């Protein structure tokens, strides 16, 4: 950025590490939220 | 001026995707083996 225009070795490696987190579980949490609405929704 | 010295090498993008990858699968059995996601209702 100022200096660093070249971030922080551990700050990228984390920030991936984080990001594939958020991509593997929007599919599961999206597959997780609808079952338990169609299990928790009281028909 | 001459390397910008990348500011993304390429081992530590290739790592970090490993690592995230295998915290994914531990994840993913452990809540299979709990049934979480067995557990489609009781």
Known sequence: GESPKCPDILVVLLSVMGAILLIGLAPLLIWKLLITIHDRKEF | ?42
């Open chain 2, 1 to 42: 001026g001459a390397l910008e010295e990348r500011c993304i090498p390429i081992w530590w993008v290739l790592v970090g995707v490993l690592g995230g990858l295998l915290l994914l699968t531990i994840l993913v059995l452990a809540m299979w083996k709990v049934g979480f996601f067995k557990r489609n209702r009781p």
